[PDB]
Amino acid sequence: PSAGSHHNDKLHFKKGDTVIVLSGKHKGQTGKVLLALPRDQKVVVEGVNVITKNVKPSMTNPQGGQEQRELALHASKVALVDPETGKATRVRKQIVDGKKVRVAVASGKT
Amino acid sequence: AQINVIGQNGGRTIELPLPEVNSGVLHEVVTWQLASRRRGTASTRTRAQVSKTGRKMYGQKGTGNARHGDRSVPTFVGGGVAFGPKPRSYDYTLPRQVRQLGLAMAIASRQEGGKLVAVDGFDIADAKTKNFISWAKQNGLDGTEKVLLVTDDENTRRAARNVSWVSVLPVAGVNVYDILRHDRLVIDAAALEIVEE
Amino acid sequence: PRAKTGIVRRRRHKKVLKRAKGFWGSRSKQYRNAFQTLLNAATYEYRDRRNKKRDFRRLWIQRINAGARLHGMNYSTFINGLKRANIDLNRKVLADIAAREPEAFKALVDASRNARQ
Amino acid sequence: PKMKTHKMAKRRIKITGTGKVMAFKSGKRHQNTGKSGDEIRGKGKGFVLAKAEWARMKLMLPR
Amino acid sequence: MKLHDLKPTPGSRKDRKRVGRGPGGTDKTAGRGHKGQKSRSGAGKGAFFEGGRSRLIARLPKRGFNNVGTTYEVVKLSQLQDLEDTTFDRDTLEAYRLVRRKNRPVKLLASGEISRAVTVHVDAASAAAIKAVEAAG
RNA sequence: CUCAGAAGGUGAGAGUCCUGUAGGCGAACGAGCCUGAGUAGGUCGUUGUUCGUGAAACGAUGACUGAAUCCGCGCGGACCACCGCGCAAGGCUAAAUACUCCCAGUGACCGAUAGCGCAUAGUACCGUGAGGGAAAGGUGAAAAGAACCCCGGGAGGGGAGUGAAAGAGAACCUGAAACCGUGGACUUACAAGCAGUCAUGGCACCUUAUGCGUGUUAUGGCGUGCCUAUUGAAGCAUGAGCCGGCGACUUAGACCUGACGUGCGAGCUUAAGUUGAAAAACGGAGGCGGAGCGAAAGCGAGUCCGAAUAG
RNA sequence: GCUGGAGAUACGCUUUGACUCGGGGAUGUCCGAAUGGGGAAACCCACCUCGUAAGAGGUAUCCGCAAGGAUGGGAACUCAGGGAACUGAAACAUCUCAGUACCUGAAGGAGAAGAAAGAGAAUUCGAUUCCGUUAGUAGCGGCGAGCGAACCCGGAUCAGCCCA
Ligand SMILES: [Mg+2]
Ligand SMILES: [Mg+2]
Ligand SMILES: [Mg+2]
Ligand SMILES: [Mg+2]
Ligand SMILES: [Mg+2]
Ligand SMILES: [Mg+2]
Ligand SMILES: [Mg+2]
Ligand SMILES: [Mg+2]
Ligand SMILES: [Mg+2]
Ligand SMILES: [Mg+2]
Ligand SMILES: [Mg+2]
Ligand SMILES: [Mg+2]
Ligand SMILES: [Mg+2]
Ligand SMILES: [Mg+2]
Ligand SMILES: [Mg+2]
Ligand SMILES: [Mg+2]
Ligand SMILES: [Mg+2]
Ligand SMILES: [Mg+2]
Ligand SMILES: [Mg+2]
Ligand SMILES: [Mg+2]
Ligand SMILES: [Mg+2]
Ligand SMILES: [Mg+2]
Ligand SMILES: [Mg+2]
Ligand SMILES: [Mg+2]
Ligand SMILES: [Mg+2]
Ligand SMILES: [Mg+2]
Ligand SMILES: [Mg+2]
Ligand SMILES: [Mg+2]
Ligand SMILES: [Mg+2]
Ligand SMILES: [Mg+2]
Ligand SMILES: [Mg+2]
Ligand SMILES: [Mg+2]
Ligand SMILES: [Mg+2]
Ligand SMILES: [Mg+2]
Ligand SMILES: [Mg+2]
Ligand SMILES: [Mg+2]
Ligand SMILES: [Mg+2]
Ligand SMILES: [Mg+2]
Ligand SMILES: [Mg+2]
Ligand SMILES: [Mg+2]
Ligand SMILES: [Mg+2]
Ligand SMILES: [Mg+2]
Ligand SMILES: [Mg+2]
Ligand SMILES: [Mg+2]
Ligand SMILES: [Mg+2]
Ligand SMILES: [Mg+2]
Ligand SMILES: [Mg+2]
Ligand SMILES: [Mg+2]
Ligand SMILES: [Mg+2]
């Protein structure tokens, strides 16, 4: 059945990080990474929004409503930023948290 | 019968046979060349004898149906194929004199318009491709024509990034197909005319 | 490589079915019966292309001696007498149309009656 | 492959140069002695007519 | 050159007989005439009275010499024709057999050719032109 | 930019957005005087090897028998002598060889009647059993998978809303044909019919299209389905309900013999394999011309019969 | 980040490094060579020792004193004992299909074979195997249908060692 993501199941960003869409609608928009889904390659962000009319199941709501909620994307929001736009990024060095590498583009860290 | 390029010079001469490229000589060499590489990988299970199906379905006579006897046959959906492809060879030994004659006509047909001879080395800094692009641009190799290259030093080929450019071979890798496939031929001037025998 | 029938059969078939047009019943909607009808239609076509010329010959003849008998002649007689008169060589088509313009066919009748006395 | 039929070997065929087929002379070959002197003498030709093609394919190399 | 403009020599390539395939040529029966002509073929040098049935006169063995007509031998211009194992002659059927010179034409000249055997008259025409021939001894 | 243009992914086709052997690094600790007796030999029955009892050697044996040992013993295709090659009756032995359950890469292979039987199932189903044995794919880029409203018990539908699109709505890509229907044009209730074809009139429409047709129709002429099999088929002789898809002159081998074409040309070419493969080169073992006549010896532009004359 | 396919809500786990990946250990009911005994496979019945019981361990035959080894399984391949007919011969006995199919035994990642009482006609070679070639040659044959070598020569690979 088609198989899942081919990106070696590797997300290019954490759930913490700020990020910007670089394609489709919402290109240029930015937000925090509210949900990362590496194996399915999917990214929750406060950018994309969608009005999900959950079907009324009277589950405390006899008549149903229409919630406004953000609908996830994938490796099309671009990674972290720093000179105010998306960037390719590189593994760095040790810090006072010396067990860690950070990131940079043509610049500093994230 | 043709000259040289940068690393040195030469004024080189050698006899060139009349090309029968559009003639069957070059056409035969190309066809033998493509056919020689064929993978013969056609195995259909087609023969009635490997379809994996039974014995003798019903009554030879008097059932009111059609006649058939087993379910493994080309008339049956699901059965075998008559005359399906099988794995096989395609390769053959084209006569040797025609091999060398073809390759010579190949070189020749290129001397009649635009062949080029790399004179005992090009200057390419380290192995960087960018300096190959500069070198070829200064030898008139625009960005346009698809070009073939033959040499022996590792580095000069290690600017072998075909970019609509730079199909690459060493010595003895030459073949009628690969040169006839490209426009200009940047033949390596050295053994390019070290005469045989 | 496989090379299944794909597009080809349907296209020949549609060519026949479009030749069918107003063919009654299956003759115009099922392929095999349309094809077979067109075999016999070939027969009829070529032979009628011949026949139509016998047909119009017959019709002009009918009209010509109808006019010839309007004046007391007949096709045998009128055609021969015209033939005897410095060979007129009007076609049988053309003699009919002069059976739509009576005053002339009349004089042709008097002329044939001449070269015959 | 394409073996030649060994029955044709020492059997009255042979291949003349120029491609013609040999044969021997048969009738009254053995078991007959009220046959005339020339008749017993009459064996040894092998020119033989419209059979040749098959006799040839009987022997690939002239064994 | 123009790989699209490669052209096979006209002639040479010729199309296969596609057999079944229409009353445009070689229709129902596939060039076979309505017959006791049916798949599983069987016979090639046989009818039933056979008539390749004439009698046989039989020897088993044979042995024969490699042939060297002196005509080519004499116009050679390089005389004293003792062959190294490789050169000129025996390319067909070389090393498996012995040599024998024979009196095919002449040109007259001196020449000492050392074949393994020879015709009586090659000695006639060789020694007549002051020319030894060394049959192996 | 490029030692990195292999490839996939991403709202349609990305060298530089993602994942990436071009290159580079990498583990706790994990794989790699003697020398063979119930023997050799033999007779009977048999058999392997090109070995069909053939002049049948030799090996191998089932029954019975049964030796020598270095001036010794086995063999050289009945057998003998000479000449020549070996040392049985004790054992072990890598590698070049075969195969594909399994794994990786590749393809003038397939792509949903194809391809394995299976886009997965030896399942459902059939058989007491051994055993046999299916078909079956597709919303959208993203569920944003349709809250709410209407007719209906529901099913189903019509709106609204999401979406580029609902001409994608879960009986969810395209969506042919047979087959069933609705509406409209032209038409048919005195008529005999392989259903068409030619001809002409009428009516209707004008986007490869106003002499031009196109569709339909009335009347006239003409007219014995198709295929197979046959002396001879409309045949009351075979076959077929209809449409769609599957469906039959191929592949092989240094085989043979012809035609055409190409390279060399009195000469022409390699095979197994070796080395290199983003490609080929090498490799004369061998094969074919080159001399024929004969049963064969053999002789040889000659050769056979035969005591020289004849073929 | 995870909380298997699963597209499901709830309980949660995880910088003390989860999850996933590479490697080892440990647990591993009952049946199955099955093997304590029986048995209609996954079940029914015991006995011996240790143990507070709960629980743990032993209990088949065949080689061995003993260590230890064998039972079974495995696509195709290998060797071996056994071994068809259809079919061709335009009928059919010899012959062919063919030592093919199939059964059975033994084994391994291969096996087989192997170190001249030979091949063979040069007083040449020098274990075995496999490929090319000789060659449809030499031969075999109701001398019918048909079956069919080897030596030389070219290559892959190449060792010979122990006994009475
Ligand atoms: Mg019926
Ligand atoms: Mg199939
Ligand atoms: Mg006429
Ligand atoms: Mg062979
Ligand atoms: Mg002869
Ligand atoms: Mg034709
Ligand atoms: Mg027939
Ligand atoms: Mg058959
Ligand atoms: Mg761009
Ligand atoms: Mg014995
Ligand atoms: Mg015996
Ligand atoms: Mg016999
Ligand atoms: Mg003897
Ligand atoms: Mg014996
Ligand atoms: Mg002897
Ligand atoms: Mg001994
Ligand atoms: Mg395809
Ligand atoms: Mg299928
Ligand atoms: Mg289907
Ligand atoms: Mg049942
Ligand atoms: Mg059952
Ligand atoms: Mg989907
Ligand atoms: Mg409702
Ligand atoms: Mg509803
Ligand atoms: Mg709709
Ligand atoms: Mg649709
Ligand atoms: Mg449906
Ligand atoms: Mg519905
Ligand atoms: Mg529904
Ligand atoms: Mg789509
Ligand atoms: Mg659809
Ligand atoms: Mg109505
Ligand atoms: Mg209607
Ligand atoms: Mg009426
Ligand atoms: Mg009518
Ligand atoms: Mg009859
Ligand atoms: Mg009739
Ligand atoms: Mg009837
Ligand atoms: Mg009928
Ligand atoms: Mg019927
Ligand atoms: Mg050959
Ligand atoms: Mg999931
Ligand atoms: Mg038990
Ligand atoms: Mg036990
Ligand atoms: Mg038991
Ligand atoms: Mg028979
Ligand atoms: Mg077995
Ligand atoms: Mg076993
Ligand atoms: Mg050898």
Side-chain angles (χ1 to χ4, degrees), chain C residues 25-85:
Chain C
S26 82
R27 280 251 215 284
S28 81
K29 338 291 287 323
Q30 337 189 134
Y31 163 73
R32 293 160 131 193
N33 224 249
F35 181 23
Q36 175 177 318
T37 308
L38 286 181
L39 302 227
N40 284 131
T43 273
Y44 295 132
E45 300 199 7
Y46 171 132
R47 79 98 189 296
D48 282 328
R49 217 179 296 120
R50 282 70 191 152
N51 286 40
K52 19 163 113 184
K53 309 159 182 176
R54 354 211 218 178
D55 306 20
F56 283 92
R57 227 265 160 92
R58 197 192 232 252
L59 181 283
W60 305 320
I61 287 218
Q62 269 164 106
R63 273 180 209 163
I64 290 154
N65 64 342
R69 293 190 188 55
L70 257 71
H71 300 355
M73 251 185 173
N74 66 275
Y75 182 87
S76 190
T77 269
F78 166 91
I79 293 324
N80 161 282
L82 256 69
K83 224 219 61 199
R84 229 79 116 170

Side-chain angles (χ1 to χ4, degrees), chain A residues 54-65:
Chain A
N54 43 7
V55 75
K56 17 63 208 300
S58 41
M59 306 306 314
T60 302
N61 73 117
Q63 39 285 314

Side-chain angles (χ1 to χ4, degrees), chain D residues 1-7 9 13-21 23-27 29-46 48-52 55-59 61-63:
Chain D
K2 174 52 162 314
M3 355 188 190
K4 79 196 45 175
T5 221
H6 269 24
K7 93 179 304 83
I13 42 286
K14 6 129 80 148
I15 343 64
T16 187
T18 72
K20 234 315 123 174
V21 274
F24 276 64
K25 210 65 194 184
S26 66
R29 169 261 201 190
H30 268 357
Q31 69 195 357
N32 90 144
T33 75
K35 249 310 79 259
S36 97
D38 156 290
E39 274 29 40
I40 303 189
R41 255 181 38 245
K43 356 306 335 184
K45 122 290 170 79
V48 100
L49 353 179
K51 101 96 125 183
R56 319 288 268 309
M57 322 153 197
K58 213 84 86 310
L59 292 165
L61 27 148
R63 185 243 121 121

Side-chain angles (χ1 to χ4, degrees), chain E residues 82-93 95 97-99:
Chain E
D82 197 84
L83 278 128
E84 181 47 55
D85 259 318
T86 53
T87 182
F88 267 141
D89 225 294
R90 323 204 276 166
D91 236 348
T92 355
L93 308 48
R97 330 166 155 201
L98 325 187
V99 218

Side-chain angles (χ1 to χ4, degrees), chain A residues 1-89 91 93-110:
Chain A
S2 52
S5 93
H6 337 146
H7 303 355
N8 208 114
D9 291 38
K10 282 213 286 254
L11 267 201
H12 58 248
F13 64 112
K14 302 185 208 188
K15 64 304 147 306
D17 290 9
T18 309
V19 159
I20 9 61
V21 204
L22 69 311
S23 57
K25 160 199 297 184
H26 293 272
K27 87 200 81 174
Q29 277 202 295
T30 153
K32 166 190 35 172
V33 173
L34 317 179
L35 197 246
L37 295 187
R39 339 127 98 341
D40 292 12
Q41 223 75 158
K42 288 228 149 203
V43 188
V44 171
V45 157
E46 291 162 332
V48 71
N49 271 95
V50 111
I51 292 305
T52 178
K53 53 236 294 175
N54 43 7
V55 75
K56 17 63 208 300
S58 41
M59 306 306 314
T60 302
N61 73 117
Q63 39 285 314
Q66 300 175 333
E67 234 149 2
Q68 144 240 356
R69 291 147 76 184
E70 28 251 55
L71 166 47
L73 305 186
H74 102 113
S76 64
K77 62 85 219 177
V78 245
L80 348 79
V81 289
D82 114 63
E84 280 93 305
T85 358
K87 86 230 182 174
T89 109
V91 117
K93 47 71 213 165
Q94 323 319 114
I95 352 164
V96 281
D97 188 328
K99 187 181 179 179
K100 260 219 71 182
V101 15
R102 296 178 128 164
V103 338
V105 51
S107 192
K109 285 139 287 180
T110 37

